[PDB]
Structure formats: C-alpha cells, structure tokens
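Honest question from a wet-lab person: if I give you the sequences of every part of a complex, can you actually get the arrangement of the whole thing, not just the pieces? Trying it with mine:
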Amino acid sequence: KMLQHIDYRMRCILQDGRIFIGTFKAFDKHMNLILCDCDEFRKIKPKNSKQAEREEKRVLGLVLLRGENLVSMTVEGPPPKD
Amino acid sequence: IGVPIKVLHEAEGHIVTCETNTGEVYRGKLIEAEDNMNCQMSNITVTYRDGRVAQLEQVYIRGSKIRFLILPDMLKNMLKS
Amino acid sequence: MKLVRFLMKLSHETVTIELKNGTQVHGTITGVDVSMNTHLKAVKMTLKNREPVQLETLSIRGNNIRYFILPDSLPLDTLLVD
Amino acid sequence: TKKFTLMEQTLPVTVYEMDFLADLMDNSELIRNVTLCGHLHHGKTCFVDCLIEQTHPEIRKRYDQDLCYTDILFTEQERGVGIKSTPVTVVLPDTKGKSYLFNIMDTPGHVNFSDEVTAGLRISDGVVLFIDAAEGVMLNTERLIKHAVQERLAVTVCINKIDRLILELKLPPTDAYYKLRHIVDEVNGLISMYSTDENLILSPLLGNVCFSSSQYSICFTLGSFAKIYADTFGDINYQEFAKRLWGDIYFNPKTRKFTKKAPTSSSQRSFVEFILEPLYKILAQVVGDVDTSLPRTLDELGIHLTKEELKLNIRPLLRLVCKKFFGEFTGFVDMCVQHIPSPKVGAKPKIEHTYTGGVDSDLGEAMSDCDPDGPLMCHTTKMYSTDDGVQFHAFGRVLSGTIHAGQPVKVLGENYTLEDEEDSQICTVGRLWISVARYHIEVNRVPAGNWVLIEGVDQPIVKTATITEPRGNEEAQIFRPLKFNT
Amino acid sequence: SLPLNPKPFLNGLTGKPVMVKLKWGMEYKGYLVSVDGYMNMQLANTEEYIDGALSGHLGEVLIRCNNVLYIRGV
Amino acid sequence: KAHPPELKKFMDKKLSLKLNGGRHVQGILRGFDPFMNLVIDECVEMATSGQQNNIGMVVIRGNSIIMLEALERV
Amino acid sequence: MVQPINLIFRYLQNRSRIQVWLYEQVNMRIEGCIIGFDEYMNLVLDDAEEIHSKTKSRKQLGRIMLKGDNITLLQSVSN
Amino acid sequence: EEEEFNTGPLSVLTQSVKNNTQVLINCRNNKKLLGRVKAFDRHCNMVLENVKEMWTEVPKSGKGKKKSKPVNKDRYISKMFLRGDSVIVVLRNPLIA
Amino acid sequence: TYQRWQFTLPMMSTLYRLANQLLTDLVDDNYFYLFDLKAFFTSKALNMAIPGGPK
Amino acid sequence: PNVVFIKTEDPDLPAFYFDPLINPISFELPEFVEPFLKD
Ligand SMILES: Nc1nc2c(ncn2[C@@H]2O[C@H](COP(=O)(O)OP(=O)(O)OP(=O)(O)O)[C@@H](O)[C@H]2O)c(=O)[nH]1
Ligand SMILES: [Mg+2]
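Yes, you can. This is the full assembly:
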C-alpha cells in the first residue's frame, strides 16, 4: 500500500494543516517520508481556482518529513521519468 | 533501521535546514545525526516565527521536537529501495 | 481482543471516518494495517469548514483517526469471531 | 599499435553513481587522501583489489590467480613486482553507512622504487602502513615510517596476512595474540625513535590499527567486529564493547563483565576469546570439514551459500565465506576517517612544509582555507605515460581554486624564482580525468583538494611542477622539490 | 516515611475516597475501586467538580491513564 | 538501542535551554540519561519579562526539551 | 557526572521541598516533598500545593501522586 | 491478562460487554458517546452499537458582532469503531435508570 | 561416461599420503628461481646456458 | 614470499601447536550473547 505509490508525486497533509507536494521516494516504520523536488503550499490545493491556483508556494527541494507530524497522503501526479 | 535514517546520516557534514515543532527554522552544518533524529549542528542561522534572524555557533535539537529537515538536493540524486 | 484485526477485515466496505483534527472522510477501504494506517478509494473528504474534495485514493496514518462509522448492515458478530 | 598497459576504454558498473562522485568531490570535507605503503609483497595491491572488487560488482578475481588491478603495465604483470605508483579514486561507506571519497595512492614496496613513495607522500594527507603478520617489521617498513613522520603525515597501520598465522605457522590463538602485540609494539618503538613529543601511539584500542587478510578478504577493526556482534545480538553497544577487546583485560562469564584481573589461572584474554577464537574456528571448519560440518557452522553464523558455491575448492570457498561474514571493509574506512585528517584540516601542516614562500601570506592563507574559488594553485608530482607511450599526462592535487578543461594556465618549474621569471610557461589544458587504475572518468572541472590527471601541460615539466593562473597572482612561489629517502 | 513509592501509595489508597485531577482541569471525587499497571483508574459513587464546584453526581467511572494529572486521597 | 544521546561533548559547559511552553533557562550540564533527562547546575530561569532568577541545581525531563544551544565552544 | 534519577534520589533522601514545572501549563506549578518515585518519574509528594503564578494563590493538597507525564522541570525550594 | 481485564479498571468495559449495558463515553472531541459496548481492547478501542452522540455548539457569531447562544445537539449512529486514545472517561453509571 | 569427479577431504588426504613417493617436497616456487620456463626462454634467446639447463 | 608451512609428524598433537621450529616470540553484556561458534 505504500510501496505502490513509491516514485509517484504525492500530496501530503501535515498536522498543522500544511500541504507538502513532492516525489515520494522512501518511507519507514514511523512513516518518516522522503520527498524529492518538494514544494510547500498553505492557502489552497488548487482545483483550478479561476482567480489563481498558487499562493504561498515555497520551493523546498529534498525533504525528510517525520511521521509524527504526517496526517495523510493522496496521489497528486505520476512519476517524473528522470 | 529505517531507510530515511540512513539518508539522514549521509547528510552529516552538509548544510541542512531544520524546522522544529514550534516553527523556528535552523540552517547550518549537520555535525551529528542520531538514530532517533537528535541533531547536532554548527554555525547556525535561526529564523523565528516573527521573521527575525539570529546567529548561533553550536546547537543540538531533540529528534521528537523536529517537524522536518531539508537536505541537499544534490545528495539525494536509495535507488535499490 | 486486538480490534485492529477486526478493522483489517473491512476491505471493500464503505465507511465514514472522523479524524482527530475534525476532518470527515467517506470512502471504500482498500486496506487497514496493524498500525491502523487506513487506505481508501473513491474518497469524498471534507476537512472541517470546507466543501468536500474527491480523491481517487487516500492514505491515513492510523493515530489520526478518532472513529469509524460502519455500515448499518455490518454483521459484527461474524467479524468478532477469530 | 603499441600497447603497454592494461588500461581500457569501457567504464564498468559501480555500486555508486558517477554524479554522486562529482558531488562528494565538490563537498571537500568527506574526502581523504591516503597513501598505502609497506615493504615488498606485504599485500597492498591485493588490498586495493579487495576494495575495487567490493565497489565494482562485476570485476572479480579469477579463482586461481589474483588480478592485481592496480598493476597496470605489462612489466608489473610479468615481473611480479610493483614498479610504479597508481592512483585509485573510490567511494566507500563506513560502519554508519555514510560514504566518503577516498583517493588512494598504491605505492610500490620494493626499496629501489621508494622515490615513488615520496611522490605519493607529497600529494596525500595520511599513510596506511601495511605489515605482514608472519614476516613482521622489515627494512622498508622502518624506512617508510621514518620518512612519513618526517614528512608530517598521520600514520595508521594495517596488519595484513593474518591467515599466515592460522594456515601456515598454525600458532595457537594465544601465541597469535602475542605475535600481533609484538608487531604493534615495534612500530610504536620506531615512531618514538623518530617522532617528537607528539603522541602518535598506535593501538587497536585507539582505533588506528587494522587486522586484515587480503587474500581471503578479511578486514576488521575492533569496532566493526564489535558491530558484527551487535548486529547478531540487538542490545549491544558498538563502541563500548569495542573498547574492551584488546589488552590484558579478561571476561567473567558469571558477572558478565570485563575484569582487568584474570578470573582463573587458565583463562583467555578478550581479544583471544571474542575475535581470534571464532576466526580460528571459521577457517578450521572450512579447510577441514567442508564436507561434514561446514553446513551446520554456516547455519550458526547465518551465512547461506547456494549449491554451486559449496562445490568450489577450498581457497575460493574460504574467500567467499569470509566475504559473507565480514561484508564490506568498513573498519578500514572508519580507521581512515577518524585518524587521517581531511584536506581542509590537513592543509595547514602541508603548506608549512611544502610551500617555499612561507606559511602566512595572501597565498598562504588562501591555501590554508582550501576554498575552491580562490586562486588556482595545483601541484604535480607525478607524470603518467599514455597507453601507447607517446605523450604524458601530469598528475597532481589541486590546493586552491578549480581547474577547467580548455583553460590556460601558467606552469612554473623548480628553477623558477619570482624575480627572475625566466623559467615558466603558458599552456592550455586539454582534458581532465579523475584517474582510476584501468579506466579514467573524464570530467570538466575539478575543485580544490582533489587529485587530477591533466592533459596538455607536460612539455615544460621536467620533474615536478606547480600550476597557477596567467592573469593575476604575481606573488606565486613554486613548491619545494621532492626530497628523497635515498 | 522510609521510601513510599507511587505504586504502594495508590494500592494503600484503594478502598478509599480519592479525588483525581485531570490535565484538562476536571476533577472527580469517589471511592477508588482499583488501579492497573498503566495507572488507569476506577471510581465508584463518583462526583464531578469543575471549577471546584459540584457539577454532576456520576456513579461508577473509568478514567483512562493518559488523562490523569494527579491523584489525591481525601 | 536504548541509546545514549551524544552529549559528553557538552558536559560541564554552560548552555541555553529552550523548553516547551515558550520557557527558557540557562545552566551548566552536569549529566544525562538515555531519555535525555538532564541535570543542570547553577540554573537560571529567563522569565518572559526579561528578568532572570537563580534556581540552583535542577532536573529537566527530556520529554519537554525542545532545543539546547551551547554558550561555550565545544 | 550526575545522573538525573540520582538527583531525585537525593531530593528524596534530603526531604527538600520540591517545586515541579508542569507540561504546557505555565500558570500553575506543583510543590511538595518527594517521599518516593518510580521508573516513570511518577512522584509521591507530601504536603503538596498548587501554585498559581498569576493569582499568587496556593491550593492545599496533602498526599499527592503526580504522574510524570506532566513533569517539565524539578527544582528545590528553601521553604 | 484476562484477569486484569476482569478485575482491573477495564472491568467497567468487561462488565458492559457481558451485560449488554449502556455506558457514556466522555470523549476528547468534547463530545459524548452513549451506547453499548460490542467489543473493547487495551487501548480502549471499542465497537459500539445504538450510539447516541451528544455535544454542544454555538451559532458562532451569526450576527457578525460576536453574538451567539450555546446549543445542544445529538445524533444516532447504529454501528461504529472508536479509537481508544480519544477516551477521557467511560461511565458505567445507571444512565438508563 | 566417467567425466567428472568430486571427492571428500579424507579421500584426498589418503591419496595424497599414498602418492608421496612420486611427488615433490616443495611448497613454494622460489626453488625454480632461474630454472623456470621464462628463464629458459630468455636463455635460449640470448644463446646462453644456465648450468643445469638446456642448450 | 616464503611459505613458512610447518609439517606435523605425529597426529596426537593438536592441530594448533607451537612447533619448536618456530622461533619463540618474547559496561555489561546481556546473558544471551556468547562468543561466536562457542559450541
Ligand atoms: N598468504 C597470504 N598471501 C597474500 C595475502 N594477500 C596477498 N598475498 C600474496 O602476497 C603477495 C603480494 O602481492 P601484492 O599484494 O600484489 O604485493 P604488494 O603489496 O602489492 O607489494 P608490491 O609488489 O611491492 O607492490 C602476492 O603473492 C599475494 O598473492 C594474504 O592475505 N595472505
Ligand atoms: Mg603492489
């Protein structure tokens, strides 16, 4: 169930309510996550919001997130080929 | 021992960024990373929740009270997993 | 006895789950594991004070669950047998 | 087509990635520059061979004769002896699992070629001194200790060929302990003869002594063998168990604690009872009881071998069993990480001894910082022929700055001084390679603190050279020329 | 007293009137029927004091261990 | 496992301790255990008012330790 | 080196009056004489008090067993 | 272990399952769940039947000027699973009586 | 077909003991210092004769 | 390099033996752990 989504782009929700979107490359027992090319969003997860899709976006890069602070994950997009 | 943990130990000696559970942001050289995510760092820049910065020579943060870490992008590019 | 075992039997059921952070999740269980980490499909998820979003897949860290609302039909006495 | 070396074009598979090597090469605080030295035939090339085998998954030994991967000449392969020093650049993990960039110079052990050792000493930060466990401390061992101490390097020791104690001399394990202790004492005596006040004591308790067997691929420190015990049994602490495994300490199995007083008269020291005794038991079960009770012993160690592996003859089988038991050579890497300084922290006593202009200057402080953006100062002590033999490529380390392919540089010879300016040359560098024994990785730029093969500068270089930038640096001085043992 | 530990103290207090403060500031007075290894607590004839004032008379009650701040005999 | 925190380097050094609740104290490290519980000597509470008050030798539970910073060079 | 548990064992033996900082509650702290304690840092306090830092008011408790969950910090007081 | 479920504080749950009796669960969410215990475990996870969930709310400044008056609420849930960490208190009092 | 054999180690030690009259007592190679094939090849090429060796 | 291999004439000696041809030289652990291959 985790290994399936590996290499995919994933939308992860934090306990404070942040949205981390990155390439899901690794996990573990605690659900500590490894996210490549990761950005953070605060205001929205866009479903094509006609005004704009992106406000308070930050480029982070290579991120290790601790599982304590993870709430949930959904598939955001397919794996980048690279 | 977890796959992410091995990758963390790999970042020892590199410049990393750390956010705590309270949202203070510490950037500097990772000296030592323990199995439980306890982190010794040096020559830090800290950016508080109000936006202000400070400078510290030496710090050590408990693993539990870390929200996340940013590691070097180059280091990431594990494959076997 | 170990009630997570009971939840692990509920693949392919549709449920509503209330989260610790107030979020409400309605979807079809693809898998519950030993940590109560729950995976779903065809998910309509309503964060507290939003309109629902639909996700093809969603994965919940077990600890973040408050409670599951089960199908009225569910034959509990069957499922409680080991 | 004249072909004098075993060098190839095809770049073989590695376990690491190549851009990860360029990453580590940029990082400049993980890398270490080591010279392997020893007496003739004490096992240096078969050790490097062991490491290469571990790193490159498909390059293997031929079951009956060894590849000497680092001997790349038809003369060294025929004549059987190391003639010319050869650089390797690999990426290795430690016991933690953190990889490092090792630049290893494999030097010849014959005493007549000791000048090649001095060339390898100029370009490197530490030295690993190999000693035959059966033969002891020999002529060139003493000479190279004296030479390494006087050239201001860190020294770590590896005691190779421990199978000679079990499989040739057949000593009882206690007398094996006594002979190894004799060797480490004699090295300490030689250092304290030559070195000053500086506590360069070596002991395996201090973690700068390595016990290996490069034929059967055994290598351990006290730390890594402790870690094998910790990996078999979960709650062992690594370091604390490591600090009790040498010396006159003993073990009390009712107390479960290490005593410095012997519990009975007939008891065994901790090293003998925890390290040598299973080693004597592994080799004896393999060479004596491959048919009867090697399966039971391989089960008890947890090692699994296939049906075709058990059909090997005894020497390949033993090498295989020991590769499965000891794994990667992380104890060596720990020894070299802990005790060989990096280029940054090691740059200061290098520029003291090495640079003619003096230690403190604009160039001196610039070098001492070892930053890769400063003035280019590169120093070449070695020159390598091509496979045909027509043209040469210089081999040096970069002390400051960064070299780029195509860029022009000024080359300064030994007889150059600042005020005469007469002995100098301007040349454009063609290509750059990160040299490896049988193949070269071609790069575009090489940062400070790293070894490099340079095309194009050879024509003004008589013996050794320094390389700096054409515009600016009117204050550059040439590094002192090599001072030989003989 | 010569060392009086958590566990015996609580065991001595079984059969007795107690009040438990919870981390959240609620208070529960009643007869301590039992405690277990994790320091979960069972009261009888429980009463609830919130803001230190009698709120509700509740009867038999289980308190999950993680909620407990402290226990007092009373 | 049951690991020690790597704090021997910080032994007998003056430190600045950030605790939960926005609380901050300063003192000399006198010891620790595997839970990261600390002994701090000559400890001083840095009140949010800015005022500082001497509390002597104290125990800090590792649970509530957010961060420490050395006021010395290690 | 002094180990934290031992410090407590000292507090116990001394019968020094102790003031405890609680977790995520600053406006109240607890006081008392440690009579005994356990592996979880759960404490048995005698003649214990709730101390309101805001109200300067003290609430009298007597025999207290404080769960260790709440312990942020342990200090001694002369009183 | 059964002995500790049988006689310890969790006997409250053990007794409720055996007698099919109602219990009120004060809950972390500030809600209360009133019903019958079909199953329970160490953590106080439970499978509950005929659950009446009760709570309280406010209009939360419906005016726009910070004016509201508290409101009680309830809802029926026939079948549900409660993760035990949310438990504050479990009451084996005579709610029916 | 009688094409491949594999023996146990007591078999090999018995055979090794029984064959020792025909076998050498050298353990290493240094006995053949200037008596190996390569020495004989060089000697032939230079027209020189090692004292025991062929001409 | 010289093979210093030592022949044994008599089988009643131990395999690991100091032959007179050789020139003479001159924290708690768990209860479960043992040396490797103690049996
Ligand atoms: N018995 C034994 N022999 C070994 C071992 N390792 C290497 N040898 C042999 O020792 C001889 C040394 O060969 P090398 O390892 O290439 O020698 P070297 O260390 O490179 O020495 P140089 O020729 O000076 O360069 C070879 O015969 C190896 O087969 C060992 O672990 N045990
Ligand atoms: Mg060699």
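Two things worth pointing out. Residues 1-82 of chain A form one domain. The pocket of magnesium ion (ligand 2) is lined by residues D 44-45, 82, 106 (CB under 6 Å).
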